[PDB]
Design a protein around this ligand. Structure first.
Ligand SMILES: CC(=O)N[C@@H]1[C@@H](O)[C@H](O)[C@@H](CO)O[C@@H]1O
Ligand SMILES: CC(=O)N[C@@H]1[C@@H](O)[C@H](O)[C@@H](CO)O[C@@H]1O
Ligand SMILES: CC(=O)N[C@@H]1[C@@H](O)[C@H](O)[C@@H](CO)O[C@H]1O
Ligand SMILES: CC(=O)N[C@@H]1[C@@H](O)[C@H](O)[C@@H](CO)O[C@H]1O
Ligand SMILES: *[PH](O)(CCCCCC)OC
Ligand SMILES: *[PH](O)(CCCCCC)OC
Lengths: 291, 291
């Protein structure tokens, strides 16, 4: 009942177990609050159904050398998204291209689409001799990758890096199919990802995007406000490097020569993220890389 | 492997159980996602210790008529915060004033301070014949009330309304004691409250605050950006009603005549929130109400 201004610390008190899951990324006395690490949520789909959506080029996912998992965009299959680009480009870099094609064309529940990716990572990790593998994505594919890493603890140590092209982590304001509702800015899904701490990278991540993206917006600030931005990630907005006259659209973000140089840098980097020293003004080419 | 633009719904798919707690307040096919309703988190303090912090004027908390629970601000006890104002003002309105004085002067862990309030509500609810009671707060007291309502399901049906004066739900940028760290904008605690859905009212709530608050900021926009704002709540920024020349500081937000008229309105309202029809320009008096 007397003087008490005393209580003085040099750190914020740790959050109680019941609130800890809601402050991932923040620092308290014990350190940075990490993501919950319990058991994986159960799949709503039979494993045999999830396996039907996974394919590797020239090999079985159960026995594959240096696999790379490609996750497609909304309204497409793995081949439709990557046949003209990262399937042959990654093969040229020494990887065995693998991809998932969640039915129907990624239009269904993003949470279900994520099951295909989680199962695929589990499969390819073991299939490659229990070795981490890179994941490369386009559009919703990135949202799926981060959703998986946020809610399925088992794959966090199985993914070595994430190279996401035009990812819509905050959804888009330019937005119906189930996944379209979920990718609309302000959706319950994008809100959940943010509130669970999903806007901070979980594995070494590189996000390549464009201010002139005609599908995903806002992307114009080259800051945390952009939909493709992840805290601690290597966030590369094309125009920040190439200037305001460099125009690549949503698909160009995945297929341009600039995108290839950045992606290649991320894939070979020992840090798991693309390095500024690997690209410059001369790589600011909007033409297709596989061309 | 053919046409599929088909999948078309009129609502966003429901979130899976594992993600539902992170999207409270959002609407999916089944409706608005509500707060989790499991068992109450366990107390870190012995109940006898929590009981020592609860007092009612002229009665025992275990047998009291029409109680009102007053929750004090940082660096004060219940009497220091309310002796000159809401203790006698509420008694005049027909209530039995009760309050908690979490030691030491609300400077300790806000999560612990909340235990005192949860225990107090449980006690007063039963003590008044299993009847809901109003909670009136000042500064951190409001943060404590909302933290309790967000994480302790049992009291949601025991609190009839919340009248918060200058509540710092987003903390303050003008910010050490444990609770001071926690009330600093960007803290793990304020982040957790927001991420768990605590910035939307849980019970009928009225938030009275001032743009000229010298302790809690920002409060100048009369919008969701203000620290005292709660979605669906009756948010009353003094200057929006009284104009830019109306100046009441942090304590004035609790004790002014304007504050009394709004508080009285909230306490007697059948909606549980203050009503615009009960106050106007003539009530824009900065002088103390108990005067
Ligand atoms: C896997 C697939 O393409 N078909 C499903 C269908 O079975 C399900 O009823 C519907 C809503 O859940 O979502 C998709 O249309
Ligand atoms: C109840 C009280 O006023 N004293 C506690 C003290 O026992 C505790 O060690 C410290 C840190 O938890 O917080 C306060 O100072
Ligand atoms: C919402 C906001 O403030 N973001 C702005 C954006 O609107 C603007 O186009 C951009 C210019 O590059 O600068 C950002 O700070
Ligand atoms: C951060 C922000 O944009 N909030 C501004 C605030 O700075 C300004 O003082 C107020 C004027 O009342 O208008 C709000 O919209
Ligand atoms: P991406 O998956 C982002 C799609 C958002 C749907 C709303 C238009 O594109 C291939
Ligand atoms: P309130 O509890 C808000 C206090 C914030 C502490 C940082 C200065 O005031 C009585």
């Amino acid at each position: 009942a007397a003087i008490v201004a005393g209580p003085k610390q040099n750190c914020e008190p740790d959050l109680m177990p019941y609130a800890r899951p809601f402050a991932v990324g923040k620092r308290t006395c014990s350190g940075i609050v990490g993501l919950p690490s319990g058991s994986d949520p159960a799949f709503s789909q039979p494993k045999s159904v999830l396996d039907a959506g996974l394919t590797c080029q020239g090999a079985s996912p159960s026995s594959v050398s240096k696999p790379i998992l490609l996750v497609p965009g909304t309204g497409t299959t793995g081949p439709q998204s990557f046949d003209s680009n990262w399937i042959p480009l990654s093969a040229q870099l020494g990887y065995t291209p693998c991809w998932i094609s969640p039915p129907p064309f990624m239009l269904n529940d993003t949470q279900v689409n994520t099951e295909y990716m989680v199962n695929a990572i589990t499969t390819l990790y073991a299939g490659s001799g229990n070795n981490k593998l890179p994941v490369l994505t386009w559009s919703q594919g990135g949202l799926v990758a981060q959703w998986g890493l946020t809610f399925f603890p088992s794959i966090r140590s199985k993914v070595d890096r994430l190279m996401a092209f035009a990812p819509d982590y905050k959804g888009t304001v330019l937005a119906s199919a189930p996944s379209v509702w979920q990718q609309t800015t302000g959706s319950a899904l994008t809100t959940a990802l943010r509130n669970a701490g999903g806007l901070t990278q979980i594995v070494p991540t590189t996000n390549l995007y464009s201010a002139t993206d005609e599908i995903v917006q806002p992307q114009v600030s080259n800051s945390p406000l952009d939909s493709s931005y992840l805290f601690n990630g290597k966030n590369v907005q094309a125009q920040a490097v190439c200037g305001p006259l460099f125009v690549i659209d949503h698909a160009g973000s995945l297929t341009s020569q600039f995108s290839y140089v950045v992606g290649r840098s991320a894939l070979r980097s020992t840090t798991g993220q693309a390095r500024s020293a690997d690209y410059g003004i001369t790589d600011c080419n909007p033409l297709p890389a596989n061309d």
